[PDB]
Design a protein around this ligand. Structure first.
Ligand SMILES: [Mg+2]
Length: 644
RNA sequence: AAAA
């Protein structure tokens, strides 16, 4: 009777019920009754016999709109001495016909101006609605304006909140905080930061010491909880955002205002900074022996980029730093190699595969797509952050403190069987493990025995699909791909609300519990599930916003390459055609089913192939193809290919 | 899937 609408292909879709089974009903376009993608609706099952698979339904009323504002392009034209207004919504799932309120239209608003509009009224029976312009965003051809519109359509806040900035600008460095008995003075240690070249939020610094029996690792994380009081205005805004947002052009929407993100909580060189340290001692094989968590004070001696460290590694450059930094980095790389070997021994799933970024010019127009490369410096930092995250998760669990975990379940036997069949057609080995009990180690060994297969890329793509998304949970579930029974996010409280919450839990229960009330502790405990829920729901939106922006920028880039031939492989097959991932740009283009040459092709959902009725020719995931870019679909932001 |  109640559920969330999702619109898909041709603006038909389905409703996922709120009942305990999450029962799914199909809904055709004609039974939507004015409802839009993501709306909460009241629905009824259709009296129809079941066509199969699922029941069908019709929307009765809209209980809550998913959005109040919608992006679109505003058009104005004059015809028989009268102004006519039209809006084209950016979102192809916005299917309602719009009547534009003339009193919402400024006299100076020109044609082809991006706007945001709201729905004033709608007629569910005719799919007609009255809308008013609520914001003027800018030139509709401007790619940065489009990126901002795409954030608005995904409910992603990006405008500066002046109240929050003013609250932040009051904050200052308390010089006496370093003298607190609970805060360890580590200002003499050769901490440094290692980050991408354009990052200005330095949340994490590392220092590694060698001892006779092994190593001691210090991971120092900006002490964000010490500056951001829970339920302060700054906190509430961070909780709404849930995370910093990173889109192309190094365009960042920070979770926290820049007085925190780039000054008080940024571990900038030669500045005294307050941190939370995860300190771990290792033996000479990289096995963890002991750990300690505590507030501290550091002075980073150097900020480095991945590029700088990597060139140093390959003896193609020197680092202009003190010898203590040089020895710490050398020990960090040695330790990092050892940690990586232990984690592989215990079981971990390295799901690395091809990644790209879009290069844009100073006006945010896309220039080209670059493939990213494995990064020795980036990998070292990754190993160190992972071991800290895992250790903090276990410390909180060992002390029986409820926390939000980062979790990732074992996939079902069913989904594994499907994956094994698909990749077996690409000469990927059939695995030997039990499908009910398969461990992280066994998936890793299976990946490793196929590393040289030409189809390794789509193998990892499909494995990732099989495994599904990681998410946050207070329930103590495993992280299958990291390979731990307990994992959380601790190292990045400048950009992630979960890490900020993890730091608050450390403060309130382990660092200075005497300074907090039992209610504060229970209140936060009671709120943890809802925090995880909001972060999980917003993470969906962020990923969708990145997808929208990627498709917008890449199809704009490709719009100048019509007629060009691209080689690639099939990444997906649907009832409407073949998705071919192009080698040169890693982007999926659509080959429409109806115009594939030489035969009439039928979608078979079981093996998810297209099979020709006369010739038995088969298209399957992984096949190598060549195709011509024939058009850009600017409505759906798709690249359409035709087989050549 | 992980890492800033
Ligand atoms: Mg960092």
């Amino acid at each position: 009777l109640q559920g969330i609408l999702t619109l898909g292909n041709k603006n038909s879709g389905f409703i996922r019920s709120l009942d305990d089974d999450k029962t799914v009903y199909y809904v055709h376009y004609s039974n939507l009754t004015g409802a839009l993608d993501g709306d909460l609706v009241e629905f009824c099952k259709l009296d129809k016999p079941q066509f199969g698979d699922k029941f069908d339904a019709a929307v009765i009323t809209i209980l809550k709109r998913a959005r109040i504002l919608y992006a679109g392009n505003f058009l104005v034209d004059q015809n028989e001495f009268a102004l006519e207004y039209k809006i084209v919504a950016d979102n192809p799932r916005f299917y309602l016909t719009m009547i534009v309120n003339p009193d919402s239209i400024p006299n100076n608003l020109a044609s082809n101006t991006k706007i945001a509009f709201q729905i004033d009224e709608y007629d569910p029976d005719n799919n007609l609605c009255k809308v008013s312009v609520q914001q003027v965003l800018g030139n509709n051809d401007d790619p940065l304006i489009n990126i901002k519109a795409i954030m608005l359509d995904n409910s992603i806040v990006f405008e500066t909140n002046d109240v929050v900035e003013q609250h932040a600008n009051k904050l200052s460095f308390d010089t006496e905080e370093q003298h607190k008995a609970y805060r360890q003075d580590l200002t003499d240690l050769a901490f440094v930061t290692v980050d991408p070249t354009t990052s200005k939020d330095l949340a994490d610094a590392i220092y590694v010491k060698t001892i006779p029996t092994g190593f001691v690792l210090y991971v120092a994380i900006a002490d964000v909880a010490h500056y951001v009081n829970r339920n302060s205005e700054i906190d509430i805004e961070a909780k709404h955002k849930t995370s910093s947002i990173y889109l192309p052009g190094h365009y960042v929407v920070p979770m926290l205002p820049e007085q925190l993100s780039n000054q008080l909580c940024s571990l900038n060189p030669a500045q005294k900074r307050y941190v939370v340290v995860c300190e771990i001692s290792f033996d000479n094989q990289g096995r963890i022996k002991t750990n300690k968590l505590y507030p501290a004070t550091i002075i980073s001696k150097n900020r480095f980029s991945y590029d700088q460290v990597n060139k140093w590694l390959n003896n193609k450059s020197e680092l202009n730093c003190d010898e203590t930094v040089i020895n710490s980095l050398k020990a960090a790389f040695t330790l990092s190699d050892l940690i990586q070997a232990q984690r592989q021994k215990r079981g971990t799933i390295d799901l690395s595969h091809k990644e790209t970024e879009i290069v844009v010019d100073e006006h945010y127009f896309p220039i080209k797509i670059n493939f990213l490369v494995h990064d020795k410096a980036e990998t070292m930092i990754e190993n160190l952050m992972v071991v800290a995250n895992e250790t903090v998760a276990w410390v909180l669990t060992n002390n029986k403190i409820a926390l939000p975990y980062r979790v990732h379940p074992r996939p079902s036997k069913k989904k594994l069987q499907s994956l094994i069949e698909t990749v077996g057609e690409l000469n990927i080995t059939k695995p030997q493990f039990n499908l009910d009990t398969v461990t992280s180690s066994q998936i890793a060994s299976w990946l490793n025995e196929n590393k040289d297969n030409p189809s390794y890329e789509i193998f990892v793509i499909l494995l990732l699909r099989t495994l599904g998304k990681a998410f946050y949970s207070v329930n103590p579930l495993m992280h299958f791909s990291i390979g731990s029974n307990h994992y959380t996010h601790f190292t990045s409280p400048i950009r992630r609300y979960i890490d900020l919450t993890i730091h608050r839990l450390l403060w309130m229960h382990l660092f200075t519990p005497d300074q907090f009330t039992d209610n504060e502790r229970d209140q936060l405990k009671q709120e943890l599930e809802k925090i995880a829920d909001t972060v999980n729901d917003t993470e969906i939106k962020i990923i969708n916003c990145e997808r929208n922006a990627n498709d917008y920028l890449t199809t704009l880039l490709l719009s100048k390459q019509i007629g060009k031939t691209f080689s690639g492989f099939i990444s997906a097959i649907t009832s409407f055609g073949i998705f071919m991932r192009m080698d040169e740009n890693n982007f999926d283009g659509l080959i429409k089913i109806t115009t594939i040459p030489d035969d009439f092709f039928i979608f078979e959902k079981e093996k998810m192939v297209l099979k020709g009725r006369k010739t038995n020719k088969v298209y399957k995931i992984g096949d190598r193809l060549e195709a011509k870019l024939s058009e850009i679909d600017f409505i759906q932001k798709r690249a359409i290919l035709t087989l050549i």
